[PDB]
Design an enzyme around this catalytic site. Structure first.
Site, mmCIF file in Angstrom:
data_model
loop_
_atom_site.group_PDB
_atom_site.id
_atom_site.type_symbol
_atom_site.label_atom_id
_atom_site.label_comp_id
_atom_site.label_asym_id
_atom_site.label_seq_id
_atom_site.Cartn_x
_atom_site.Cartn_y
_atom_site.Cartn_z
ATOM 1 N N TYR A 161 1.667 3.563 -3.041
ATOM 2 C CA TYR A 161 0.711 4.194 -3.659
ATOM 3 C C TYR A 161 0.650 5.822 -3.277
ATOM 4 O O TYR A 161 0.052 6.598 -3.832
ATOM 5 C CB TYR A 161 -0.701 3.673 -3.653
ATOM 6 C CG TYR A 161 -0.508 2.102 -4.648
ATOM 7 C CD1 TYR A 161 -0.607 2.192 -5.983
ATOM 8 C CD2 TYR A 161 -0.674 0.846 -3.912
ATOM 9 C CE1 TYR A 161 -0.618 1.056 -6.642
ATOM 10 C CE2 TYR A 161 -0.521 -0.047 -4.856
ATOM 11 C CZ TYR A 161 -0.531 -0.171 -5.961
ATOM 12 O OH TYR A 161 -0.581 -1.341 -6.773
ATOM 13 N N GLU A 186 -4.042 -8.964 -2.087
ATOM 14 C CA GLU A 186 -4.737 -7.760 -2.547
ATOM 15 C C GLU A 186 -6.228 -8.177 -2.377
ATOM 16 O O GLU A 186 -6.828 -9.401 -2.489
ATOM 17 C CB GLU A 186 -4.765 -7.886 -4.195
ATOM 18 C CG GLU A 186 -4.373 -6.357 -4.961
ATOM 19 C CD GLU A 186 -3.724 -6.520 -6.166
ATOM 20 O OE1 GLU A 186 -4.199 -6.412 -7.107
ATOM 21 O OE2 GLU A 186 -2.530 -6.796 -6.073
ATOM 22 N N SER A 210 0.976 -1.319 -0.119
ATOM 23 C CA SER A 210 0.156 -0.081 -0.047
ATOM 24 C C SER A 210 0.809 1.295 0.035
ATOM 25 O O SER A 210 0.718 2.361 -0.670
ATOM 26 C CB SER A 210 -0.934 -0.129 1.212
ATOM 27 O OG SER A 210 -2.100 -0.538 0.881
HETATM 28 N N1 LIG Z 1 -4.265 2.062 -3.332
HETATM 29 C C1 LIG Z 1 -3.715 0.790 -2.722
HETATM 30 O O1 LIG Z 1 -3.504 0.599 -1.581
HETATM 31 C C2 LIG Z 1 -3.542 -0.538 -3.512
HETATM 32 C C3 LIG Z 1 -3.561 -1.532 -2.695
HETATM 33 C C4 LIG Z 1 -3.277 -2.944 -3.195
HETATM 34 C C5 LIG Z 1 -3.474 -3.020 -4.949
HETATM 35 C C6 LIG Z 1 -3.833 -1.906 -5.464
HETATM 36 C C7 LIG Z 1 -4.003 -0.551 -4.942
HETATM 37 C C8 LIG Z 1 -4.145 0.513 -5.824
HETATM 38 O O2 LIG Z 1 -4.592 1.401 -5.448
HETATM 39 N N2 LIG Z 1 -4.099 -0.304 -6.988
HETATM 40 C C9 LIG Z 1 -4.643 0.427 -8.243
HETATM 41 C C10 LIG Z 1 -5.842 0.061 -8.738
HETATM 42 C C11 LIG Z 1 -6.118 0.834 -9.924
HETATM 43 N N3 LIG Z 1 -5.205 0.373 -11.156
HETATM 44 C C12 LIG Z 1 -3.779 0.703 -10.621
HETATM 45 C C13 LIG Z 1 -3.524 -0.134 -9.325
HETATM 46 C C14 LIG Z 1 -3.916 -1.748 -6.907
#
Ligand SMILES: NC(=O)c1cccc2c1C(=O)N(C1CCNCC1)C2
Length: 350
Positions: free
Chosen positions: A246, A327, A243
């Site tokens: 991001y 995930e 996480s």
């Molecule tokens: N935000 C997080 O903590 C997060 C945590 C795990 C996986 C993802 C995100 C995230 O935001 N992901 C995105 C989704 C939209 N496509 C790009 C990737 C995948």
């Protein structure tokens, strides 16, 4: 002068920083002269998503160029960039539309925030911090450093952070308990559902005014499906390591925010590879992307009925998975109850 705590006030200043908005934009190569912040529009962002989806379809079909060029011109007409020379990059592949889409997501949250930071009574009775705080529609309380809650959270952050990606080190500067208006009666019906966990969700700082103000949301129909490994939903992780990536921080701006949400997962549909779904199998209420690394199950803790998987990172049973970390995806915005928000300092090893 605000009656709020310094940590909270300083949180308000952070998520409402205009400079940060112009920085995230310029970093996107967006021409601030052609497309200043104020000029940003929701409709405009919708149209851009649509163009990107047409490119995906074009890319997938194998469009005979020109059409891939005309779509590229179209996107850059909607979103004014400054390249100077060499001409704009041609959006002719998954990689390109994926990145361009991630930016539109971000740009969207910036419009939400700027539209807020500029809307309402801008009088001079109440101080800027108080006014803005209200705009968030969120209850923000500081959690004491020396408290069971803080103890738990810090352990969750420390354990789920490793060394195989030890490009940086994490420092918890502040932790807040958060309760958005509405997010309670909306989550209630889903609480009466098993498999409720405390997971991570990292995002850029510029997106937080929109997140607190409107809660975590699902991509719109017009948004291209490329990038969303498991369809258009809300993504979470059980390891701060996944996480925290991001928040997009650097040695230039080492401070970011990360949420801790209680998610009613229900029966999980377990997969090892990308799969656009949105429509789960009967009895399934969420998707779980199996990663190569999981938190030590023996270290799982609880409270209220919410499981906190803060155990140190070990090797899961499957490595035949494409994912490195787990995930969790939910396709209903009401399956999420944001509980805490952390301000973290990223110390890069370099
Ligand atoms: N935000 C997080 O903590 C997060 C945590 C795990 C996986 C993802 C995100 C995230 O935001 N992901 C995105 C989704 C939209 N496509 C790009 C990737 C995948």
């Amino acid at each position: 002068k605000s009656k709020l705590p310094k940590p909270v006030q300083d949180l308000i200043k952070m998520i409402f920083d205009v400079e940060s908005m112009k920085k995230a934009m310029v970093e996107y190569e967006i021409d601030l002269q052609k497309m200043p912040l104020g000029k940003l529009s929701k409709r405009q962002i919708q149209a851009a998503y649509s163009i990107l989806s047409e490119v995906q379809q074009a890319v997938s079909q194998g469009s005979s160029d020109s059409q891939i060029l005309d779509l590229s011109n179209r996107f850059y007409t909607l979103i004014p960039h400054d390249f100077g020379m060499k001409k704009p990059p041609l959006l002719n592949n998954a990689d390109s539309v994926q990145a361009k889409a991630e930016m539109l997501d971000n740009l969207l949250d910036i419009e939400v925030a700027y539209s807020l930071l500029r809307g309402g009574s801008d009088d001079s009775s109440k101080d800027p911090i108080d006014v803005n705080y209200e705009k968030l529609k969120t209850d923000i309380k500081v959690v004491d450093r020396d408290s069971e809650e803080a103890e738990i959270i810090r352990k969750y952050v420390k354990n789920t952070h490793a060394t195989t990606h030890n490009a940086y080190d994490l420092e918890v500067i502040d932790i807040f308990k958060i309760e958005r208006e509405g997010e309670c009666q909306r989550y209630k019906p889903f609480k009466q559902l098993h498999n409720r966990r405390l997971l991570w969700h990292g995002s850029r700082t510029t997106n937080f005014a929109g997140i607190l103000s409107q809660g975590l949301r699902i991509a719109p129909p017009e948004a291209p499906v490329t990038g969303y490994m498991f369809g258009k939903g809300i993504y979470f992780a059980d390891m701060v390591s996944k996480s925290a990536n991001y928040c997009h921080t650097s040695q230039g701006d080492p401070i970011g925010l990360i949420l801790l949400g209680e998610v009613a997962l229900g029966n999980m549909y377990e997969l090892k590879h990308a799969s656009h779904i949105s429509k789960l199998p009967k009895g399934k209420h969420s998707v779980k992307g199996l990663g190569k690394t999981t938190p030590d199950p023996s270290a799982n803790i609880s409270l209220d009925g919410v499981d906190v998987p803060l155990g140190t990172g070990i090797s899961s049973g499957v490595n035949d998975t494409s994912l490195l970390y787990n995930e969790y995806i939910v396709y209903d915005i009401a399956q999420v109850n944001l509980k805490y928000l952390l301000k973290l300092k990223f110390n890069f090893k370099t």
